[PDB]
């Protein structure tokens, strides 16, 4: 993990995410939306739970991206919760929650749920 | 459960649900949207897992409502997953998934998630 997590990850929609996993559980980096234009980049911050694993379990982690930068303000934030599995074909399997700020009346429809799998290729 | 589940349930938004829990795990009834006009009623079908409970656990259940009737076709369906707790103040605590039919491009945004608590009052 940590060294194994640090790097560029890609998902099946065309998004790219680049993270540095720090020694004491920190996850810092940027998320880039498709097109890959100069600033389809947003800041991401998260944490991972490092442990001794004598049974090949994955490393639990999560991160958040607020969809606001100097070109866009989508008034929403997404959190990804999942685990990192390293090896020949390392991947991060996640489930995410995307919440939009709404008025109280629309709070019932404020959160979407999905899943993403990220690979190094 | 079963006898305890059968009846009218109300949630915190103003929706009403009326179910009959059949002997062999069936859940059949109707869901009514706020206003409570003649047909804000949709059919609901589900199942519940009946067991001997010597430790006061809740009864797991779930049901589905397709949002189509003779006045509306909202092209979506919602499933509620939760448990029934009976007693003085019996309630059904749930988490739901509402999926809309979308084109493949919008499949990422097709499902919302929420939670509802239903009571007999």
């Amino acid at each position: 993990a940590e060294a194994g997590i640090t790097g560029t990850w890609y998902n099946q929609l065309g998004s790219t995410f680049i993270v540095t996993a720090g020694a004491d559980g920190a996850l810092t980096g940027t998320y880039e939306s498709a097109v890959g234009n100069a600033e389809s980049r947003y800041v991401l911050t998260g944490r991972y739970d490092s442990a001794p694993a004598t049974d090949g379990s994955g490393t639990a982690l999560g991160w958040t991206v607020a969809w606001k930068n100097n070109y866009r303000n989508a008034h929403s934030a997404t959190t990804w919760s999942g685990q990192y599995v390293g090896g020949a074909e390392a991947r991060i399997n996640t489930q995410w929650l995307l919440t939009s700020g709404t008025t109280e009346a629309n709070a019932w429809k404020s959160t979407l749920v999905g899943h993403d799998t990220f690979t190094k290729v | 459960a079963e006898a305890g589940i059968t009846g009218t349930w109300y949630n915190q938004l103003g929706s009403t649900f009326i179910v009959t829990a059949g002997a062999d795990g069936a859940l059949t009834g109707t869901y009514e949207s706020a206003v409570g006009n003649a047909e804000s009623r949709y059919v609901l079908t589900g199942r519940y897992d009946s067991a001997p409970a010597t430790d006061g656990s809740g009864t797991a259940l779930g049901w589905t409502v397709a949002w189509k009737n003779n006045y509306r076709n909202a092209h979506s369906a919602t499933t509620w997953s939760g448990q029934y707790v009976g007693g003085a103040e019996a309630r059904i605590n749930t988490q739901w998934l509402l999926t809309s039919g979308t084109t493949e491009a919008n499949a990422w945004k097709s499902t919302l998630v929420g939670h509802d608590t239903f009571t007999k009052v």
Partner: peptide, 8 residues
């Protein structure tokens, strides 16, 4: 939304 696929 910036989290989606290309719109293309």
């Amino acid at each position: 939304h910036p989290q989606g696929p290309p719109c293309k």
